Design a protein around this ligand. Structure first.
Ligand SMILES: *[C@@H]1O[C@H](CO)[C@@H](O)[C@H](O)[C@H]1NC(C)=O
Ligand SMILES: *[C@@H]1O[C@H](CO)[C@@H](O)[C@H](O)[C@H]1NC(C)=O
Ligand SMILES: *[C@@H]1O[C@H](CO)[C@@H](O)[C@H](O)[C@H]1NC(C)=O
Lengths: 96, 300, 91, 97, 48, 49, 91
């Protein structure tokens, strides 16, 4: 399972910003113009209708991936390791 | 660089979609994520409020912190015995820690947390009763096989991961404006350095400790103000504005590790076999669903 | 998302807030957008003026009886958009 | 090579590796409501979609009836062919005619 | 006027009960072309 | 002629008759947890079937 | 399935019981048996010494806060065994 963690928005108030291409996993980033945000306490930008929001998203292993994970293997030719018992002359001999 | 000191960290208001009033709201408790990977039905919840810590931040079990949406937007503390978790019926609070909860829950299509006496918040999460083996049961029986499974640890000092933490950005209070008679001012609360960066006619950035006239802002809709001394860390939830510096200032533990354990699974009724030529007729009795797997002992 | 505040036992018609000024909606086109209180989120203690876009007190606020804050939703048409107001009562 | 909603949608060399790679079909959308949330949509994890129809494992679907164990990966007690044995009996067991 | 969870009956009672109960199959209702348990933050804001 | 998991698996000439005869497929199992219970597993009632 | 008892306001490290001696399990193979408390049944007041297999007091037992008894579970591997211990707190 991925965690698809979403970082905090990058909001600036009527200045055009773009985001650099990060190398983090499944990095999807977009810019939204004409935003005018509201979190608790009212308007977050003074400037009226040209503000820019930056939305960021990338994936990461879930905290429970230490147990709930699948490992992909490539399997080549196999070799045997057989264990024998040899009872020659009523003398038991166990070997591998 | 994992830190267990919660004095450097504040809770945050989280915007969540289903409050008690059947509408999204900013709440002191907000469910960021819910994990259900244990085999006993225990779910781990990440909540915007801290648990088991007092307002200063010291380790104080049965009292929890929350950032309140009242007039004095600061950290407040409250009793842990008036908090409820529920999915369809009430959930048994197995454990708690800062930003994290762990509970046995009945099956349901949603998970909600509330602070009774209400500030409930609900998220969509489909949790069901889970197997451990190849036979279905409500609860494990007295007679079983005791197979290995994995459950969430109830001890809070183990670590299933880590969460990155960052400094909090501007918050831009509305109650810091005095639009009156065509001219606007700032309300500094008790002479604090609430700063301002705003665009009356051009970008003007300053720090005021007293009530200050503005040079060119006519209405209050084009100028904001916010506090500056905010050196308390916060989780990188998508419900807050990041600062200009958004590095990993600290890392908190993710408690309730998925520890392996033993747990009993039932044994079904032993089937009776009738032998006919090249084949067997198995007579099967199973009150609950039970898996039968057959395979030929040859090439195919 | 609009956090407003009122005092205790405020009279009828007293100021609670200005919804249109804080949301940036134009006042002289509020009537064309059908500015109305959402019927789901109605508070009997507070009303709003359709013409002026101002939220004010209808009934005298009883702190003991209502408790814990009030929630009121508004909606506008063409384009269709709702907004939320949370009102604190002081003691 | 990754496909959204399929097994191996997110891959890495190890569990704690820094070089995580994934191609989940994630898209960010415009915030319709005037708040500060990040609205996003994304394809479902291919891990859960593989667990939904993983079928039966090799411990139940395997020829010649031999059981699969892990750490290390092995198939114990298989019965299919014949082993040529060249065995040198010591002369202490051989007795006079 | 009451908001209720889905159920097959409606009961009104006076606690402390003189309750009364009738058959009424109520189900969770929709507005659009998507099942949703509760309305989400991001949406289309249709007329209902 | 009793058989388990079918009609007539328990039989008597009367409800109060002491001579009750039955052949339900019941088996007693070794107790796993170290308590004093009696772990048993029985075929389902052919009356209810 | 074991029953132990503690007095009120006991200090840290005081004796409660011997799980391995009561269950008949030998002490010297407890490390090979994988002796450990079950991650589900854990209490913040009582712990166990794994080398000696002795259940004792970790935190001072608050009679008012915990109430009504304390439940603990232990488990061992090869053979896979699970055992349960119930502790009474006096007043
Ligand atoms: C506020 O800022 C001023 C800037 O000159 C500084 O001198 C002062 O110490 C700060 N703090 C107060 C007044 O608490
Ligand atoms: C896949 O999961 C769905 C739940 O969405 C379930 O109904 C179905 O039985 C599962 N299996 C298959 C083969 O579709
Ligand atoms: C086989 O058994 C005989 C008699 O029991 C014994 O004397 C002899 O030592 C055994 N064979 C060998 C090769 O040791």
């Amino acid at each position: 399972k991925f965690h698809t963690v979403v970082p905090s928005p990058q909001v600036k108030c009527c200045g055009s910003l773009e985001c650099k291409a990060s190398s983090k996993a499944d990095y999807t980033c977009r810019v939204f113009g004409g935003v005018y945000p509201f979190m608790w306490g009212g308007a977050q930008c003074f400037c009226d209708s040209e503000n820019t929001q930056l939305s960021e998203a990338y994936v990461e292993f879930a905290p429970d991936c230490t147990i709930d994970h699948a490992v992909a293997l490539k399997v080549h030719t196999a070799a045997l390791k057989v264990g024998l018992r040899i009872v020659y002359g009523n003398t038991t001999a166990r070997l591998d | 660089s994992i830190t267990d000191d919660f004095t450097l960290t504040s809770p945050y208001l989280g915007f969540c979609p289903y409050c008690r009033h059947s509408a999204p709201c900013f709440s002191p408790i907000k469910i960021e994520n819910v994990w259900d990977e244990s085999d006993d039905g225990s779910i781990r919840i990440q909540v915007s409020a801290q648990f088991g810590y007092n307002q200063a931040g010291t380790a104080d079990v049965t009292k929890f912190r929350y950032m309140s949406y009242d007039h004095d937007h600061d950290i407040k503390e409250d009793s842990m015995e008036k908090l409820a978790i529920s999915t369809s019926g009430p959930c048994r609070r197995l454990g708690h820690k800062g930003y994290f909860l762990l509970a046995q829950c009945p099956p349901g299509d949603s998970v909600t947390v509330s602070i009774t006496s209400e500030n409930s918040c609900t998220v969509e999460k489909k949790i069901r009763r889970k197997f451990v083996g190849r036979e279905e049961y409500l609860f494990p029986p007295v007679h079983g096989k005791l197979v290995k499974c994995h459950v969430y640890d109830h001890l809070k000092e183990t670590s299933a991961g880590y969460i990155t933490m960052h400094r909090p950005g501007p918050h831009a209070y509305k109650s810091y404006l005095e639009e009156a008679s065509g001219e606007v001012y700032i309300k500094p609360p008790s002479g604090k350095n609430v700063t301002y960066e705003c665009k009356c006619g051009d970008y003007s950035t300053g720090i005021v400790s007293t009530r200050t006239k503005m040079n060119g802002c006519t209405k209050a809709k084009q100028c904001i103000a916010y506090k500056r001394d905010q050196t308390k860390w916060v989780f990188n939830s998508p419900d807050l504005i990041r600062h200009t510096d958004h590095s990993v200032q600290g890392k908190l533990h993710i408690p309730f590790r998925l520890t392996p354990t033993v747990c009993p699974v039932p044994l079904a009724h032993t089937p009776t076999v009738t032998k006919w030529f090249k084949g067997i007729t198995l007579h099967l009795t199973a009150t609950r669903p039970t898996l039968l797997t057959t395979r030929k002992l040859g090439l195919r | 998302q609009l956090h407003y505040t009122v005092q205790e036992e405020q009279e009828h018609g007293t100021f609670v807030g200005n919804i249109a000024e804080d949301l940036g909606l134009d006042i002289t086109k509020l009537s064309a957008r059908g500015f109305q209180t959402v019927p789901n989120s109605r508070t009997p203690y507070l009303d709003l003026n359709l013409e002026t876009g101002v939220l004010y007190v209808n009934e005298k606020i009883d702190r003991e009886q209502i408790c814990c804050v009030l929630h009121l939703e508004v909606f506008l048409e063409n384009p269709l958009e709702l907004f939320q107001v949370e009102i604190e009562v002081l003691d | 090579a990754m496909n959204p909603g399929a097994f191996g949608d997110i891959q890495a060399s190890s569990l704690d590796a820094t070089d995580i790679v994934a191609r989940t079909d994630i898209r960010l959308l415009k915030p319709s409501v005037k708040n500060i949330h990040v609205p996003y949509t994304q394809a479902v994890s291919g891990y859960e979609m593989w667990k939904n129809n993983s079928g039966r494992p090799l411990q139940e679907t395997a020829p010649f009836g031999c059981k699969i164990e892990v750490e290390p990966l092995r198939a114990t007690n298989c019965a299919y062919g014949h082993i040529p044995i060249s065995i040198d009996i010591p002369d202490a067991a051989f007795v006079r005619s």
